[PDB]
Amino acid sequence: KFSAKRLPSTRLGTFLENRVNDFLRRQNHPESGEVTVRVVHASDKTVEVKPGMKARFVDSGEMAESFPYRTKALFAFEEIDGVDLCFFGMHVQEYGSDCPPPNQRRVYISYLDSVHFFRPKCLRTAVYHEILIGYLEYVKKLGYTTGHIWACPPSEGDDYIFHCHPPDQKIPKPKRLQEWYKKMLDKAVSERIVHDYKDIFKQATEDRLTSAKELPYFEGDFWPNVLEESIKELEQKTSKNKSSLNDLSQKLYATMEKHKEVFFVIRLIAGPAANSLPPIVDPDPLIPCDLMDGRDAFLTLARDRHLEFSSLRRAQWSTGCMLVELHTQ
Ligand SMILES: C[C@H](CN[C@H](c1ccccc1)[C@@H]1CNc2cc(-c3cnn(C)c3)cnc2O1)c1ccc(C#N)cc1
Ligand SMILES: [Cl-]
């Protein structure tokens, strides 16, 4: 027995678990258990502007070469019949106040994962929502002004965090997923945490973006790849001399409009408040941990040790083995 509670605490983990546990005590369903939330990885990294954008905007001195962020991995656990189950995982990128524009004071959710056995089932969505809303409230309080979600569904073919999901864990279709995020965000608005939210196209237009260098540039996100493909397309075109008598931006706006419902921009701090904030100071220390850096290490260790999250039983066993790995290391 190495319970989840034994892992080192953080201000972030504590704030999230308090919000969940408080919510659950309000509901007072007899099936629910205590929820533990632990940050198991935090390190400092940079996202590099890829070759095409570098040539056009970095090399000309118009855009930073890379953007510093803090990556965090965290997990939520539920005690079920006296035994911790890992049911939720999240990886985020946090761009602080010392980050050059356009990434300044922005959080991006890299990946969400879950193992759908939260007990009771009827509170499962609500709990997921409380974690996400809590995360937004927490980073708002530190002074992050904007959250960013890429709201596409996972593939059976490529596990985000947990190796081997339940065969009957249901992957949403795009429109259902988008509605899930809106319901979460609507609750956040009603709690006066999120001021408002927009699709990326409406957000860009209102900020009067005119150059791609002004678009937030996140590690592994859709938009850096779009820009690389667009730039390649543009530089492939030749044309002959004319007779006597912003393409990039136009392509960007076109692609943004086409895909707008997938990409959410979440305004946490609005209007004058946003202009005169103090520095962002994160009270939590770095947490080196090779196992929980990126995704491949933990997926590798689960593959190699035949751990699965495909049933409650197996998921509890994998939880236990994971926790024992996190202690020993
Ligand atoms: C808060 C949760 C997050 N759930 C994740 C998630 C991330 C991003 C988008 C959706 C889901 C996971 C990601 N991976 C995944 C795999 C499978 C799977 C793989 N093989 N098989 C047979 C099933 C089923 N559900 C998953 O949801 C959550 C749960 C439900 C919704 C909805 N709607 C949203 C978030
Ligand atoms: Cl010709």
Side-chain angles (χ1 to χ4, degrees), residues 51-265:
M53 286 287 287
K54 181 185 182 290
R56 184 159 310 233
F57 295 115
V58 172
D59 288 348
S60 59
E62 302 177 63
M63 181 183 189
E65 176 251 300
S66 57
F67 295 96
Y69 63 100
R70 191 160 288 188
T71 187
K72 291 183 177 185
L74 71 79
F75 287 115
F77 306 84
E78 195 194 11
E79 182 197 72
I80 295 177
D81 300 350
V83 174
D84 285 320
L85 167 80
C86 195
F87 70 97
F88 175 89
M90 178 171 57
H91 293 187
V92 294
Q93 308 173 18
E94 305 183 340
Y95 299 81
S97 43
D98 287 357
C99 178
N103 286 19
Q104 199 170 262
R105 300 186 173 257
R106 301 185 181 254
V107 305
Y108 171 74
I109 304 179
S110 302
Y111 297 94
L112 296 183
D113 206 348
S114 66
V115 191
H116 71 168
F117 297 113
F118 183 83
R119 192 163 294 179
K121 180 173 301 188
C122 61
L123 290 185
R124 183 171 64 197
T125 292
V127 171
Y128 292 154
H129 285 183
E130 290 299 303
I131 294 160
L132 294 182
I133 294 173
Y135 174 74
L136 292 176
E137 181 182 18
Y138 184 83
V139 292
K140 168 174 181 181
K141 283 177 76 182
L142 291 181
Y144 295 91
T145 62
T146 316
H148 291 262
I149 296 174
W150 176 6
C152 69
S155 287
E156 290 171 57
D158 173 66
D159 300 312
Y160 286 167
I161 296 171
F162 299 113
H163 178 68
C164 189
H165 285 82
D168 60 344
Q169 191 167 315
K170 290 287 193 273
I171 294 176
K173 286 299 180 286
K175 281 163 165 173
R176 177 175 163 71
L177 181 58
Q178 295 158 22
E179 290 301 307
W180 192 97
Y181 281 114
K182 291 187 205 178
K183 177 179 145 194
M184 185 270 288
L185 291 171
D186 287 348
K187 190 174 295 159
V189 170
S190 293
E191 291 175 10
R192 66 258 191 235
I193 293 166
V194 165
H195 181 274
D196 71 295
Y197 65 90
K198 295 158 160 57
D199 68 69
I200 190 170
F201 174 80
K202 193 188 193 192
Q203 191 64 71
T205 62
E206 294 191 12
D207 296 353
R208 299 305 304 174
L209 177 149
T210 63
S211 179
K213 74 187 162 181
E214 300 178 307
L215 193 76
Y217 199 101
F218 297 138
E219 183 62 64
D221 181 53
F222 190 69
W223 293 104
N225 287 326
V226 163
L227 292 168
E228 290 304 293
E229 294 168 7
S230 301
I231 287 168
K232 283 182 177 165
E233 293 156 2
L234 289 170
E235 292 184 350
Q236 283 285 280
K237 288 161 184 162
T238 62
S239 61
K240 296 197 173 177
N241 290 350
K242 310 304 177 184
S243 86
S244 184
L245 305 169
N246 263 76
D247 287 350
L248 184 64
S249 293
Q250 174 255 283
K251 290 189 63 170
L252 180 54
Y253 266 99
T255 305
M256 284 189 299
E257 190 174 355
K258 178 179 172 189
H259 288 291
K260 59 183 177 156
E261 310 81 354
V262 169
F263 296 94
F264 291 75
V265 183

Side-chain angles (χ1 to χ4, degrees), residues 272-285:
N275 296 118
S276 56
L277 295 169
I280 282 163
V281 180
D282 178 358
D284 288 323

